[PDB]
Amino acid sequence: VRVMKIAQNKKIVTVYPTTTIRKALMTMNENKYRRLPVVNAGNNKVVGIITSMDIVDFMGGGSKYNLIREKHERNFLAAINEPVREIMEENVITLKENADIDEAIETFLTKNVGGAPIVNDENQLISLITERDVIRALLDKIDENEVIDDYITRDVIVATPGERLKDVARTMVRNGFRRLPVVSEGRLVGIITSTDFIKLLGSDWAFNHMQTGNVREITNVRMEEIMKRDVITAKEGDKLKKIAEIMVTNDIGALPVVDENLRIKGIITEKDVLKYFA
Numbered sequence: 001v002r003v004m005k006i007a008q009n010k011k012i013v014t015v016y017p018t019t020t021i022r023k024a025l026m027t028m029n030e031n032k033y034r035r036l037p038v039v040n041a042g043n044n045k046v047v048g049i050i051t052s053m054d055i056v057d058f059m060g061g062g063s064k065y066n067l068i069r070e071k072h073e074r075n076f077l078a079a080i081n082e083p084v085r086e087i088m089e090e091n092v093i094t095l096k097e098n099a100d101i102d103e104a105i106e107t108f109l110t111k112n113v114g115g116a117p118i119v120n121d122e123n124q125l126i127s128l129i130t131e132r133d134v135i136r137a138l139l140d141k142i143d144e145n146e147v148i149d150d151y152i153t154r155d156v157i158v159a160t161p162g163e164r165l166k167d168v169a170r171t172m173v174r175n176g177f178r179r180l181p182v183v184s185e186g187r188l189v190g191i192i193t194s195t196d197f198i199k200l201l202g203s204d205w206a207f208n209h210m211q212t213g214n215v216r217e218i219t220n221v222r223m224e225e226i227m228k229r230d231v232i233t234a235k236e237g238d239k240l241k242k243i244a245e246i247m248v249t250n251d252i253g254a255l256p257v258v259d260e261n262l263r264i265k266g267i268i269t270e271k272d273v274l275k276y277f278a
């Protein structure tokens with residue numbers, strides 16, 4: 001069952017190694033695509049990939065932050081004029097154009113990636129497949145009585161309403177999690193994702209600070225200011241197919257699992273759903 005058969009027939013939105021970080025961000029925010037292959041202009045060969053998590057790293061979450069703090073002496077606006085090649089991931093995990101669905105699933109499940117460029121024998125970009133694409137294709141094949149319980153991640157990494165963005169960013173990047181439930185006194189009170197951090201950057205409130213920057217008030221912002229308070233949740237006993245359908249029809253990748261009292265029992269994501277087909 002060739003992945004190309006599911007592969008989104010659209011044109012893949014890409015950037016080049018010399019595209020600035022700023023332009024890559026605009027590309028992300030505009031096209032709503034939070035995963036961008038980096039290709040030569042060129043021969044269309046995949047030479048890198050950049051996602052919102054790399055941007056969260058750059059902003060403070062990880063080692064890429066030292067482009068701002070050291071080279072550009074804390075100037076975020078200057079730093080974003082650097083070519084995306086400075087912060088992209090190289091050594092991309094890709095699939096061959098003759099790869100089947102089984103391979104894609106094993107790749108997603110064992111290599112901690114949610115999306116992979118599909119390339120030909122010259123490493124030229126052909127398409128791209130993500131976990132959502134696969135779940136969407138296989139949704140009707142999930143038994144309707146199957147429950148979510150065995151698929152839930154029980155030990156949840158979490159943010160709080162009072163945490164500063166700079167510290168939540170660390171939590172996201174160190175743990176490799178795009179989405180953190182926000183918890184206060186054991187109760188779910190919101191959700192925050194790497195996407196929220198990009199959206200903050202493209203705000204009026206943000207560009208205002210950057211000019212007088214003082215870029216620092218961006219990363220000092222607390223979760224309560226920017227989190228989504230009303231969260232789509234799952235609960236023990238829910239059908240896997242219902243949950244999978246909610247994700248795929250809403251472009252959401254993660255639901256916090258809660259009590260009727262909103263205590264957190266776990267989290268379930270698209271990768272977990274795909275463990276049904278492992």
Ligand SMILES: Nc1ncnc2c1ncn2[C@@H]1O[C@H](COP(=O)(O)OP(=O)(O)O)[C@@H](O)[C@H]1O
Nearest residue numbers: 008011012013033034035036115130131132133
């Ligand atoms: N760069 C891109 N160009 C075109 N389509 C994309 C691109 N990135 C993701 N998609 C598609 O848009 C949807 C969003 O991807 P998921 O949300 O699946 O990946 P991501 O969180 O990295 O953006 C997916 O269904 C995927 O098929």
Ligand SMILES: Nc1ncnc2c1ncn2[C@@H]1O[C@H](COP(=O)(O)OP(=O)(O)O)[C@@H](O)[C@H]1O
Nearest residue numbers: 049050051053054089092093112113114115116
């Ligand atoms: N196909 C891939 N090959 C190599 N690295 C990738 C790939 N996809 C994403 N990444 C990297 O994994 C890190 C986490 O990204 P996200 O958190 O955006 O990835 P994912 O949604 O696939 O779990 C980022 O540094 C990103 O560049």
Ligand SMILES: Nc1ncnc2c1ncn2[C@@H]1O[C@H](COP(=O)(O)OP(=O)(O)O)[C@@H](O)[C@H]1O
Nearest residue numbers: 153155156157176177178179180253267269271
């Ligand atoms: N915040 C979290 N705390 C603990 N585990 C998580 C968290 N987010 C995701 N996971 C788990 O890690 C594995 C891979 O998660 P993934 O699909 O990359 O999540 P995300 O979309 O947040 O990056 C899954 O088993 C998922 O349940």
Ligand SMILES: Nc1ncnc2c1ncn2[C@@H]1O[C@H](COP(=O)(O)O)[C@@H](O)[C@H]1O
Nearest residue numbers: 063064065066067069070071072086087
């Ligand atoms: N892409 C990068 N990611 C993280 N840190 C960087 C990056 N580029 C430069 N730096 C750091 O910023 C400073 C600039 O050094 P240099 O670019 O060699 O003049 C050094 O402290 C580097 O460690």
Ligand SMILES: Nc1ncnc2c1ncn2[C@@H]1O[C@H](COP(=O)(O)O)[C@@H](O)[C@H]1O
Nearest residue numbers: 191193195228230231232252253254255
């Ligand atoms: N389970 C959820 N319930 C409500 N909003 C969510 C949920 N998951 C993600 N979001 C929001 O959806 C938007 C895109 O998130 P993302 O899953 O990172 O692409 C962000 O503003 C998230 O805060």
